[PDB]
Amino acid sequence: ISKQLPQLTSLELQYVSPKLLMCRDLELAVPGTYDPNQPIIRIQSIAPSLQVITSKQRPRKLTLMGSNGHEFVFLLKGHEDLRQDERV
Amino acid sequence: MKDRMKTVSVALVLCLNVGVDPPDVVKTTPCARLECWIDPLSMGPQKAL
Numbered sequence: 001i002s003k004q005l006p007q008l009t010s011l012e013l014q015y016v017s018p019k020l021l022m023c024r025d026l027e028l029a030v031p032g033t034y035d036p037n038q039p040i041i042r043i044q045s046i047a048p049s050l051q052v053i054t055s056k057q058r059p060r061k062l063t064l065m066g067s068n069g070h071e072f073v074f075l076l077k078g079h080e081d082l083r084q085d086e087r088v
Numbered sequence: 089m090k091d092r093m094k095t096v097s098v099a100l101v102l103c104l105n106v107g108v109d110p111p112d113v114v115k116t117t118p119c120a121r122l123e124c125w126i127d128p129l130s131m132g133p134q135k136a137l
């Protein structure tokens with residue numbers, strides 16, 4: 001395994017999450033935004049593949065397309081308690 | 089068929105070096121470079137070979 005993780009790269013959703021690859025217009029809002037005083041952008045779709053960043057840890061660079069066509073970029077990652085960050 | 093000469097062995101000479109673009113060629117965005125229906129330029133050279 002240690003001799004294959006360095007060769008790790010961008011991953012396609014077909015092989016890790018067929019359900020998300022088939023995901024289309026939901027009732028959900030874009031995760032990072034909710035304004036009750038303004039219209040809510042609905043999740044339109046997600047990218048076919050994610051990009052793996054290389055370090056001691058390996059976050060994943062997710063792209064997401066909203067109902068307005070705007071693209072939003074996020075870092076997916078584990079081993080973390082982000083509640084402290086929300087409070088800060 | 090008095091001639092019965094059969095083939096016995098096969099040599100697979102894969103001279104291609106993954107990720108190296110010779111000066112002879114200038115590619116374009118739709119240069120799908122599938123070989124054996126398998127295009128892991130993403131995975132890096134060793135997995136590809």
Ligand SMILES: [Mg+2]
Nearest residue numbers: 075076077078
């Ligand atoms: Mg994360």
